[PDB]
Design a binder for this molecule. Structure first.
Ligand SMILES: OC[C@H]1O[C@@H](O[C@H]2[C@H](O)[C@@H](O)[C@@H](O)O[C@@H]2CO)[C@H](O)[C@@H](O)[C@H]1O
Ligand SMILES: OC[C@H]1O[C@@H](O[C@H]2[C@H](O)[C@@H](O)[C@@H](O)O[C@@H]2CO)[C@H](O)[C@@H](O)[C@H]1O
Lengths: 132, 132
């Protein structure tokens, strides 16, 4: 997995670019924007493509409780295939771009100032993760 | 050339992604963010890779006069070779990403609300221009 500290927090217009491959036997993988590395802590964004159940779930987490889930339209990910995700942190929320198209806009639940850590893991084979 | 309107202007954290190829005979190509009037050649951003002089120049233009040029470090473009540029419209300015690295940060001179047209031209072959 990728696990990167953002010590200075993220400021409006941070762009996370994730390039990788979905393994042919993949279940699920995630991109998390978190407050910190203590296990089970706050998540401003939990982005969770699920190949096993044909859905992409967005959510937040506070004080140990998942929020209200959102689902993206369809599944722009395929077993055995590469992908490129952009996550664009503006003042409105997180715009997820997959492939050549905007995929979903997840409006902020937590303050952006609370993100200190990016985590990419699960069933995914990474080419690169960049924070611009 | 590619020419696309930004009907609400360029919004904060707009991401422009430009994929193309530098022809083997290239002189220079440009990405311009311009005002919306037929009359107008004001450029909030003039991004100008120059293979003939081996430099990449950033500048702005207003009322027919170029401002102070900024030069990027080296030239991450090669005749005969494909490229991917991101232009990220931030709070502070335009962040230019080439390949896998942030390349140059051009601080704002013109107001974002005056940018209405993205134009890509010169000696370049485009695969895609996308506004996220
Ligand atoms: O909300 C994200 C979490 O979902 C958890 O599974 C949910 C499931 O999606 C929902 O339909 C319902 O059954 O509640 C489950 C548990 O909260 C995952 O277990 C967890 O990993 C998150 O992805
Ligand atoms: O600032 C962008 C413009 O550069 C012009 O070329 C400059 C050149 O870079 C510099 O050496 C100067 O002293 O002479 C020229 C006049 O500005 C280009 O002609 C113009 O197209 C812009 O790219």
């Amino acid at each position: 997995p990728h696990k990167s500290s953002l010590p200075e927090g993220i400021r409006p217009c941070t762009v996370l670019r994730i390039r990788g491959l979905v393994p042919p036997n993949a279940s699920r993988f995630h991109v998390n924007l978190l407050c910190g590395e203590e296990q089970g802590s706050d998540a401003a964004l939990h982005f969770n493509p699920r190949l096993d159940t044909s859905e992409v779930v967005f959510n937040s987490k506070e004080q140990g409780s998942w929020g209200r889930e959102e689902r993206g339209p369809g599944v722009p990910f395929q077993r055995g295939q590469p992908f490129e995700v952009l996550i664009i942190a503006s003042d409105d929320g997180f715009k997820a771009v997959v492939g050549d198209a905007q995929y979903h806009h997840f409006r902020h639940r937590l303050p952006l100032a609370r993100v200190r850590l990016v985590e990419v893991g699960g069933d995914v084979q990474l080419d690169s993760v960049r924070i611009f």
